[PDB]
Each structure stands twice: as C-alpha cells, then as structure tokens.
C-alpha cells in the first residue's frame, strides 16, 4: 500500500548515486586522444542539427518581448527602457533557460534514445569482448558535444532575440535607434551581464547532457524502457535547470 512510495523513492535515489559514479569515470579518465578526433562528427547531431529550432524560437521570443515591453513601457520610458529590458532579459534569464529547455528537448531526448538503442540491441555490449571500452568510444564524444554545443547555441539565441526586440520595438513601433543602443551599453556590462549568461549556460550544459547519457544507458533491457527513458530525460533535466537557475541567479545578481 504505502511502502510502495517508500520503495520508489529509495530506488530512484540509489540511481542518482550510480549516475554520479558514471560521471566520474567518463570525465576522470580519457587518455585515448587518437579516437577523440571524431567528436567533431558527433557534434553534427547535437549542435549543427539544432540551430533551426534555437533560431526560430529566439526570434519569436525577441518579438514577444518587444511587444509586451512596449505596451507597458509607453507609460514609463520606452525610449530608454526597450533597450535596457530587452537586452537584460535575454542575457540574464531567457537565453540560459529557453535555449536550455529547447535543447533538453531536441537534443536531450534524441541523445538518450540513441544510447538506449545502443544498449537494447546489445550492440554496445558486444564491444566489451573486443576490448574497446564503450565509455571511451561511445559516451565520451557525446558528452563533450553537449558541453560545447549548448553554450554556443545560448549565445545565438540571444543574438536573435536582440534582432527580434529591435525589429518590432524600434522599427515598427516608433523608437530611437540612438537611445536603444546607448541604453543597452549604459546598463549591460560585459562583466557580468554577458558573462553570467555564459556561466549559467555551462552549468546547464553539463547537468542536462549528463542526465541524458545516464538515463539512456539504462539497466533494464526491456523495449518499454526506451519510451520511459525518453520521457524522463525531458522531465529531470527540465526541473534541474529551473532549480539551479534559481540559485545561480540569486547569487549573480544579489
């Protein structure tokens, strides 16, 4: 009856312990430099194949911020405020979260599904007998592609969001280019409004990809488990991004 929940919680938490151990091995020892020349290939499916989604969302978010900012800011200071609010919002809160979640979706479920199949088909297992450690051959380049790709995407998301904001806020709705640009320069500091967006992005890139690899590399070889793993990678990295985003922003701007 009740003990059921008890057992569920106990096992899920044991699994986090396992994930921590896996992460340690993959990051801790990677001497096979000759085979890491392929991670550039792996990046194709994490980074290159995801620009379309990040770019389109960045444009819609920029345009939305432009319109909502404007309808509020006409009562307070659009001439000075569209610039400052569009750029701070995108650099501090949205590029690191919206790109992080779209990424967790598009790259995250695809990646976990792929590791999942590698395990389910027994293909991965056959490598143990050939002496090729699957963590160094299969997992390593996938985790690294995730680390590099999300941060570069995060920057693009914001770059597009700025275009979106200006396109409506300045060009269709009647605001000065001068004060838009100077306002942004007056209030946006590289140190640390641009820099903190990047730091949060690295944290999310590691946490989110780490989960996707871990769940794909599941214990139970049952077909039902692939769909379960895919749903869970989206849910867990999604909450983790929001949880960590809160703490990091609390420090960075508090």
């Amino acid at each position: 009856t009740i003990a059921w929940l008890g057992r569920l919680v106990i096992e899920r938490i044991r699994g986090i312990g396992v994930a921590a151990l896996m992460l340690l091995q993959i990051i801790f020892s990677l001497p096979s430099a000759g085979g890491f020349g392929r991670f550039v290939y792996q990046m194709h499916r994490v980074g290159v194949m995801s620009l379309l989604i990040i770019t389109v969302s960045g444009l819609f978010i920029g345009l939305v911020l432009g319109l909502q900012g404007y309808s509020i800011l006409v009562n307070v200071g659009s001439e000075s405020m569209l610039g400052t609010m569009v750029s701070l919002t995108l650099l501090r809160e949205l590029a690191p979260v919206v790109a992080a979640l779209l990424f967790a979706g598009r790259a995250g479920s695809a990646l976990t599904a792929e590791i999942g199949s590698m395990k389910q088909s027994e293909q991965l297992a056959s490598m143990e007998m050939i002496g090729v450690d699957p963590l160094k051959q299969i997992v390593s380049p996938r985790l690294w592609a995730g680390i590099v790709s999300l941060p570069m995407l995060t920057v693009i998301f914001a770059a597009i969001g700025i275009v979106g904001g200006k396109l409506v806020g300045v060009d269709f709705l009647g605001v000065d280019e001068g004060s838009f640009w100077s306002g942004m320069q007056n209030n946006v500091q590289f140190g640390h409004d641009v820099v903190n967006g990047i730091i949060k992005s690295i944290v999310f890139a590691l946490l989110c990809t780490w989960i996707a690899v871990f769940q794909g590399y599941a214990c139970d070889p049952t077909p039902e488990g692939i769909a379960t793993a895919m749903t869970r990678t989206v849910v867990y990295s999604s909450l983790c991004v929001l949880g960590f985003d809160f703490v990091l922003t609390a420090v960075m701007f508090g």
Binding site: S121, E122, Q123, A125, S126, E128, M129, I130, G131, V132
Partner: protein
C-alpha cells in the same frame, strides 16, 4: 581451447539463474546448450565469456583462472574468441567495411592496405564479397546476419559462440547457416558453441549436448545418449511432447 566451468552460480539481483553448473567445453568439438525459453541461456554464455561476475564460480581458459589475469593477459585473451549475438549486433553508423574490420584495431597496428585485404577475404568466405561499402542498414535479413558473423571470425579466434542461430524463421536461412557453421568449423579448426531453440536443428549438429533448465543440468550426452537417459523432463523437452512437467492453473466448483 578447453574451457572449464565449475560450480557456477549467478544471481540477477535476488533471482537465482544458475546453481552449480558444471561444464566441459571440449576442444575441437561442437557443443550445444538447449533448454526452455527464458532460463538464462544467454546469461550462461556471457558468464563463460567473462563479461559478468560469477558468484563464487570458477572459470578456466586452458586451465588459467580468468579472475586472476592481469590487464595484458585479459586483453590479449579477448582476441581468442568471437560471438554472434541474437540481434546481429551491427553498428549502424558504420559501413560494412568497418563492421568487419573493427576488431582488428583492438589488437593490431596494421597498414590500411593489409586491413583492407583481410576484410575482403573474410567477406568472401561467407559470400559477402559484393557488399563492400554499403551501409548495413540496407541489407536484407540473411545478408545482415552474415555480416555480423564475418566480424566474429575476423581475428581467427579459437572459439565462436552463436547465440540463437537457429531461431531464424526462414528455411532458406536455416540451410545457409547450417552450412556455414560446418564449413567454417572445418576450415578454421574451430571450437563452437550453439545455444538455441527448435530441436530438429541442434540435434543434428552438435557432437555433445547439455540440457539446462531452472539453473540445473537436467542431463548430458551425445544426441543418442540424451534419448537413452532421457529423464522425463528431458524426454518431453526434446520430443516437444505435451504432458511433461508443465502446469496451468486448475480447480473447479
């Protein structure tokens, strides 16, 4: 190679799969394992192959305890065996060339020119000379499986394991695989293990057979001896007969 398996015991979590299995994998012979579905046949091969940790069991390769082997001894030992898995285990991201060539890079440092020639020879030995440079995902069923086998024999291993080779449904394929096993067995002086289902096809191939169920050996012998000493479990199992020690729920009021 002679492989000793003694007092094997293995649990998967809390469930016991094996309980003191004793096997003699005879040199140069074809041995086979038969039994009911789901009783750990694949688990047993994985334990023999050293990929799982046995619980207090002893596994010896040419008399050497695998648990005591150094990293170099183990690594070198890997080149002594190859296996064909139930799904075929092909790598979808690589063309056939790499799928067969692949294990060569785990043990050797060869020029690309010699690597290519070995791939060509191994594909010819199984009738796949013409599939060169095609992606494996584009192969028909019979061809798909033959490629996987070519990988297993790529390094001239002493031992080949076949996990469910006769579970293929196509009578044409059953014909071809039977012939390849016999052909390769002789050409390369191989010791082989066939672990399968559908008895009309392992009883005519193996030299020696074990019948395994519920973690225990239920009898051993040549095909003739198993019939001679066919304890009722074995007898009905090999016959495919009804009214064996098989239960279903039943009571009425």
């Amino acid at each position: 190679s002679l492989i000793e398996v003694k007092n094997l015991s293995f649990n998967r979590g809390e469930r016991v799969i094996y309980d003191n299995i004793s096997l003699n994998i005879r040199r140069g012979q074809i041995t086979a394992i038969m039994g009911p579905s789901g009783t750990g046949k694949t688990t047993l091969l994985r334990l023999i192959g050293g990929q799982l940790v046995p619980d207090q069991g002893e596994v010896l390769l040419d008399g050497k305890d695998i648990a005591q082997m150094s990293r170099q001894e183990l690594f070198a030992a890997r080149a002594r065996m190859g296996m064909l898995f139930q799904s075929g285990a092909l790598f979808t991201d690589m063309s056939v060339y790499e799928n067969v060539a692949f294990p060569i890079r785990a043990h050797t440092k060869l020029s690309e020119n010699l690597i290519a020639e070995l791939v060509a020879l191994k594909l010819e030995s199984v009738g796949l000379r013409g599939t060169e440079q095609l992606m494996p995902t584009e192969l028909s069923g019979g061809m798909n499986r033959r490629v996987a086998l070519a990988r297993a024999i790529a390094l001239d291993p002493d031992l080949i394991m076949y996990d469910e080779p006769f579970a293929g449904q196509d009578p044409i394929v059953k014909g071809v695989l039977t012939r390849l096993i016999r052909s390769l067995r002789e050409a390369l002086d191989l010791t082989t293990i066939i672990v399968s289902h559908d008895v009309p096809e392992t009883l005519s191939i193996a030299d020696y057979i074990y019948v395994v169920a519920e973690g225990k050996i239920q009898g051993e012998g040549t095909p003739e001896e198993l019939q001679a000493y066919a304890s009722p479990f074995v007898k009905q199992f090999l016959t495919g007969s009804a009214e064996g020690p098989v239960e279903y729920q039943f009571s009425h009021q």
